Amino acid sequence: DISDFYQTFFDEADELLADMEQHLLDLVPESPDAEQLNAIFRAAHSIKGGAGTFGFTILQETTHLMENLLDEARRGEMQLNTDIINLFLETKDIMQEQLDAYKNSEEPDAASFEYICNALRQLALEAK
Numbered sequence: 001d002i003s004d005f006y007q008t009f010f011d012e013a014d015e016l017l018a019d020m021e022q023h024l025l026d027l028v029p030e031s032p033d034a035e036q037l038n039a040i041f042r043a044a045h046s047i048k049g050g051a052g053t054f055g056f057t058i059l060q061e062t063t064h065l066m067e068n069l070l071d072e073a074r075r076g077e078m079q080l081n082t083d084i085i086n087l088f089l090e091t092k093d094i095m096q097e098q099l100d101a102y103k104n105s106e107e108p109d110a111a112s113f114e115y116i117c118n119a120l121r122q123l124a125l126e127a128k
Contacts, residue, residue, distance in 0.1 A: 002054065005054070006054065006102070009050045009053075009054065010099065010102070010103050012046070012050065013047050013050060013099050014096075014099065016043035016046055016047055017043070017047070017092055017095060017096050017099070019039065019043055020040050020043045020044070020092050021089065021092050023036045023037075023039050023040045023043075024040060024085055024088050024089050024092065025089075027040075027080070027085055029080040029081050029082055029084070029085055030080075030081075032073070032080055034074070037070065037073055037074040038074055040070055040088075041067065041070040041071060041074050044063050044066050044067040044070055045067055047059070047063050047095065048060055048063040048064055048067055051063055056098070056102055058098050058107075058108040058110075058113050059095060059098045059099060059102070059108065061113075061117060062091070062094065062095055062098065062113060062116055062117060062120075063095060065117055065120040065121060065124070066088065066091050066095075066120060068124065069088075069120060069123060069124060069127075070088075072124075072127060077127075078127045084123065087119060087120070087123060090116065090119075091116055091120065094109075094112050094113075094116045097109060097112065098112075098113070
């Protein structure tokens with residue numbers, strides 16, 4: 001029954017992933033427009049909550065780690081650069097694959113999950 005609420009989430013998520021991608025591509029690393037970063041962070045926060053609500057473990061954890069990083073960057077605690085933005089784009093790419101698996105009642109890719117989470121946690125570490 002709870003699956004009766006997946007379709008709306010899947011559509012919202014796809015749209016938010018597209019927005020995330022465009023904002024990422026338009027970001028100026030050394031001087032990121034505050035309003036643009038806030039939008040990326042909000043898309044991630046939204047996707048994370050939906051993932052939690054429906055028990056999409058892999059997507060939730062992946063988005064969780066990205067969100068914390070986007071929070072650091074938007075609060076100005078973390079400096080951005082082209083490498084970080086490329087990591088965010090790669091993260092958006094992987095999240096889309098995870099979502100596409102759920103749409104098919106399939107399980108996301110375990111290896112891609114471990115790789116992206118490892119990279120995101122490495123960056124946070126480096127940020128500290």
